[PDB]
Amino acid sequence: QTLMTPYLQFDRNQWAALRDSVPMTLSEDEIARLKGINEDLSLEEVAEIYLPLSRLLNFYISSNLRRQAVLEQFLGTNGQRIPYIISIAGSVAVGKSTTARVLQALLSRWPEHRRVELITTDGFLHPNQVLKERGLMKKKGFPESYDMHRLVKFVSDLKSGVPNVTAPVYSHLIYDVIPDGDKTVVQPDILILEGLNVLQSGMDYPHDPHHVFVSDFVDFSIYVDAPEDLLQTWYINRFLKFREGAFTDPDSYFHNYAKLTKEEAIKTAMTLWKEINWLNLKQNILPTRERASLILTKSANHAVEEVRLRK
């Protein structure tokens, strides 16, 4: 078998096989916290995939702390609680949120940190008002719909030792950044950053370039992959269910999508996909996959089929 990439390859079996000295199981409580998270997520999927994943990440995080100690000694450094940041990328409705939320659950179970914050990139979009002014609100999720000078600043601050760093928050009810709903990140041990753009660089923002990227401040990055045809279906389904804020909202900017019949809805969904989002993926997201530390490849039902980890 001849290939050889910068990645170690594992098919489902090989992954769900990895056992570590001292058995991996999940207590009652954990088992609960997760069904509330997605409930479409099977416990077997969690045990076979994410449990071992979290185990993997812990080795990485732990090795880091060990290093912190050695160095803190060598150069004599007071304190400064610099959190370990793990980012999660991928296309729309790929499971970015779910994965993040799940890892945050499991990762807390380690006495080495146990403290894990989670910030989703959506909060860093330009408020609908600004988007309307730039004629971008059918383009939410494109490099121009993001204020990532602010985002890079966020993780930059976190990695700078700034104690309490605040972050904007996006609402899935009114689908707009919450006016005065910014969240305060109080020195966490681990910060998980979920979003479509966590892997992008200034090369993706020529209209307003930046020279130090989000990745420059992220310790470990995870990209959630899936074949195009699948991404299409998942996108469509999200639309079907959310109609892009069409619902929850007096008469959302896209209130008109409410009246759409199923046939019309999916008809619309894939015009939006084929003409907008499919290109966002193809040219702004997909190209960053190889920039990830670990790549998860899913099957039609979100089951993880492959796992690639940088050598």
Added chain:
Amino acid sequence: LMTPYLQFDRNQWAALRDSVPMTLSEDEIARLKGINEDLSLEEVAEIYLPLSRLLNFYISSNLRRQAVLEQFLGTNGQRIPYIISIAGSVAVGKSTTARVLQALLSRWPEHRRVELITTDGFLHPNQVLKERGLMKKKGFPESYDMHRLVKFVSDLKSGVPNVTAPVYSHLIYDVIPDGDKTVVQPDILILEGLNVLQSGMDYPHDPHHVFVSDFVDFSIYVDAPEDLLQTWYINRFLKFREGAFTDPDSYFHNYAKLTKEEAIKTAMTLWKEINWLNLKQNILPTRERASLILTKSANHAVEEVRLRK
């Protein structure tokens, strides 16, 4: 005001080296003197010795990691090298720094084997540059074939056994036709060059979406104030004149006839009109992408050291 870098002035740095009294054999002292000779042993002991001590903590910490994971996943084999990249402007001391660290880093039993590849060999051959009218622009994103360079480190971090790299000659001042070097699974590979910290963002004419930085474990940027960089650049030109003194058919043969005052006038024009711009827009902007920053004074003496938090 806080930042992503820890700061140390010459004093503080030359201070954490007392930890584990570190000396060095007489032959290595010979070695180094041969490398630069303008490099004082004092500077080596005060700066680069503890620098290498630092890198070792990072590298060894990593090997322990490897073991741990190697177990958990039962991967085995594969000799993935630890890559350190060194960036900076022209005549800033990239080569020297790289060659020096290569010396010191090998004295650790965990490593001991450290290759050194310099970015220059990845420039397009003069023939090609001439075709694109870029050979007064050697060092600019377009004078580089970095799809090749990116592939080089990608290959290395892919586990590919023997990976070759093109080599640049400082005699002919061109990439040597059949002079490619083979990198035979070393422990540490040091990549010295001007562009080691750039991204596709600097290559719009032919972008790439996975950067050299994505395959480098530790990056060092050598900094110095503009006025100094100019001096150093000019001094280099005065000394070498783009190989007009070693290649009778050098493309810049005419630089030979220049008298010192003419040479300096020339260099300062090249800098002010070309290289000053390369630095200002393709090189300096990448400084903050470095893991560690070295700041030198008029005499290449390192006055400050910043390491990412």
